[PDB]
């Protein structure tokens, strides 16, 4: 999250609490289909990585 | 049961906490840097029956209405942050502080702790720690060939190297001051951690920014006045006797209420 | 000044007992 | 039982350890080469009741939160290595160190120890030992045909033979310095072995490398000044008495609570 | 209501403990478990923060 | 992760506040006294009901 | 009768047992090699009325169910196997131990016992016994004409015959180490025996395999801290007070129940 | 009676014996031909409540069973027969002994 | 702590021991988790504030 | 140092339930 | 428990004791099933938490 914020233009100090509960680190897996084209879209599967309780209405970024 | 018994129960608990504070102070004599503790008490609710104002007639007013009240809730235990006596421990590795300030320490969890204890020691890697491998701040390493370690009243630590006739500047030992010294939350080990009531820590060299000086070769004693603790202990013994008498009287009242 | 080191040590631990009455009146 | 009882029990343990080390120190007065051992303490748990932060309203902060605290856990009985006095024995085989410095000794079990005592001797095989077979490094063998033995203040030991009037050096007796003089652990007979808490022992000749000087005909007495340690005894005895008073006060406390 | 954490030197806020005041407290119907229930004679529950 | 520390050479004592227990036990004896008096009153009432 | 009276009765038993342990520890001061005993307690059954889980409705769960609990069953008594203080007794037949290990002994039944008491003797046959004729093992025979016996820190025992200018080596006194020192069963006479909680005995020379050393002319004192014992005595007395008060309260409750 | 009362009884008896031995020693200062004495102690029974071995379950073993233990029985009063210092009485009819031996 | 049935319980009691195999067990022979087998020769045992 | 081994040895059986008072010491 | 006739009864009682044959009986002599025979000169008898 800090890396994303720094890339967007916000640099959080290294020493901080940063105790958030609305985000979850996830692994996204996809099946690259044969003859895949540049502009096409595919379905993905998102699985929680840490100790997230649920991903009911989350958004993958 | 009976309102008397609840009020007296709170009184017994308050006296018990006071005696606990006194006993902790009493046990912690001869403990370097320890700060005395003082309990501040605070009465609980007042259950009103007739309101202190509450105009009775169209002209009279009923001054000083009736309200009963309960409890002696101990509201706080302040920690007297006054300078202790310095004693000449004659060790080149004990440094006391004359005036406000704490030695910052990095805990194994990494969070910042603070100690007013100068019994510094050196681990197997040569650095400065405090009696448990608590790596002091900022990072300081004593070179292996160092002979005598001096901690200047300005706060600079330098070592006497092998052969070379120079006490090379090897590190800086700088203190931290808070707006609310009393607010620091003790966690044992003679350690205080910052809390949202202590205020942000201000790091500065000893002797400046209001911080105190470093006295090498000394140790700061606990500022425990033994006679004051004795008088407090006598007083709390009397108070506890009295409150137990109150509980006894309420119990006898109840007993012959039931025997009725 | 050694007298004050104990004469006032006595009457700083006796000027409190008389309030709180753990009186022996005989070790005085 | 009662919190104050536990806390005062810890205090009694701590002050008993204080008086134990003071009595051990008196046990070694006027015994040359002894160092005034001292005990360093440490406070245990602080039972938090109200956090020193604990925002009690939208705006109120409640500084100096209440917390009780227990115990006086003694972390250590450290070994004070300070300079003591010197006494005239008028013996050439008895050497005293002035300033920093430790005598290297090759331990009979094959390790290295150090001692601030130089009452050396000569055995049947010529090895330089000191009351227990304490051989120095490097090994020095006194010739059997020697007439007089002289150890210079610089660490040079030499012997004189019949006829030739030349004081040919027979060995070098250099000192050993520690970054931390306190962390050394004793293995008896005033021998202290190299420890992970003492720092790397640097072998350095006397006079140079910032070491002390050697006094022939003198022995280093123990640094146990009777006056200072009597003052310590008086203070520690007062602390012990008051802690025991707290224990008995908690006893009378409970007795009146039960006669209720 | 707030809690302290593992070194975060400030109590993270966790919530609010609201209360309710009724026009007529004696009119609430008690159901057991030390619980009362709103009736026609108690009026509506006026939610509020403590102290106001 | 919020867990406690370890102190070797120590044992944690029971956190029983004995004074609270003694006063609570006085309270319990008197409460039982009161309820027994209630049972006795009901018994005597039911007496003069039967004697009727 | 009442579920409370059995609980209070178990409490009386627990305090009585703990006082038994305190009395035995207290009385066995000045008994060499004695190891302080400490009783460890543990509560019995919790008779549950509502399970701590046991979801009541489809959403509720009933946290912290209702279970009552009984008793303070004394689960064990450990024995503190720490090194006792040595004292200089100046007798050649008193050998103390520095470090882990036990002397072996042959009981008259033929099975082997173990003891940390070196206040040895020589019987009318000249063999090495211990205050009860218990032949130490392996058997050591002191020749009649010997004038002294010297028992080195290596356990190598030798005597000085008259006339011969040599300390003829009369034997080797070896120690025994157990994996669980606390698990040894005590049979009195300051003697322990083998049990499967202790494990197989490992016989070894003093110094090796972690066994101790032998100090001739020293006696190992009982490690009974009088201060801790006395504070335990105060606390146990008050706990017995409180538990008997509980029994009295339940008795009065029952008697008013009966009067109706 | 009470299990602790008997143990404390033995403790008082043992300490009284020790003090009587010490008082006998301190009374015979300056008594020729006297030898010092030293009381050696020894503990009595240990009543087993749980045998320190005595497996409870199939896996567990119950280390350090519960033993109450009693008594401080004084097993001996050894007489330290150490040679005593000699002093000049200048009397023809007094002879001291250097070393072992006893006049019969 | 690991019970004989193989299930696990939880205790705030530091009265530990070592059995004949060198495992830490707790006054009743219950083998703790995670297993700790003290070597047979061990002279000193230390347990840091971090538990190692 | 005659009455010092006696003094140091006195501080062992010190009996915190009734110790050396300041007046006696 | 094995009744004298031959069938089996069941008791929630443990005031046991050993008869002349060393059998484990129940205060009235009815042998406890399955049979347990304490040897002739047992120093101490222990019955663990799993009944061995």
Automatic annotation (TrEMBL), chain A:
Q: Which family does it belong to?
A: Belongs to the FlgI family.
Location in or out of the cell? Bacterial flagellum basal body
**Organism domain of life:** Bacteria
Q: What is this protein's gene name? A: flgI
Report quaternary structure and partners. The basal body constitutes a major portion of the flagellar organelle and consists of four rings (L,P,S, and M) mounted on a central rod.
Which segments of the protein form a coiled coil according to its record?
A: none
Q: Which organism is it from?
A: Salmonella typhimurium
What name does UniProt use for this protein? Flagellar P-ring protein
Q: What does this protein do?
A: Assembles around the rod to form the L-ring and probably protects the motor/basal body from shearing forces during rotation.
Shown segment, full-protein numbering:
62 to 122 of 365
Tell me the organism's taxonomic lineage. Answer: Bacteria, Pseudomonadati, Pseudomonadota, Gammaproteobacteria, Enterobacterales
Automatic annotation (TrEMBL), chain C:
Q: Which residues of the full protein are shown?
A: 31 to 58 of 232
Protein family: Belongs to the FlgD family.
* Protein name per UniProt: Basal-body rod modification protein FlgD
Its gene name is: flgD
* Positions of transmembrane segments: none
What role does this protein play?
Required for flagellar hook formation. May act as a scaffolding protein.
From TrEMBL, chain H:
Q: Where is the Flagellar basal body rod protein N-terminal domain?
A: 7-35
Compartments in which it is found = Bacterial flagellum basal body
Q: Which residues cross the membrane?
A: none
Quaternary structure (record): The basal body constitutes a major portion of the flagellar organelle and consists of four rings (L,P,S, and M) mounted on a central rod. The rod consists of about 26 subunits of FlgG in the distal portion, and FlgB, FlgC and FlgF are thought to build up the proximal portion of the rod with about 6 subunits each.
Similarity comment text for this entry: Belongs to the flagella basal body rod proteins family.
Protein name as it appears in the record: Flagellar basal-body rod protein FlgG
The species this protein belongs to is: Salmonella typhimurium
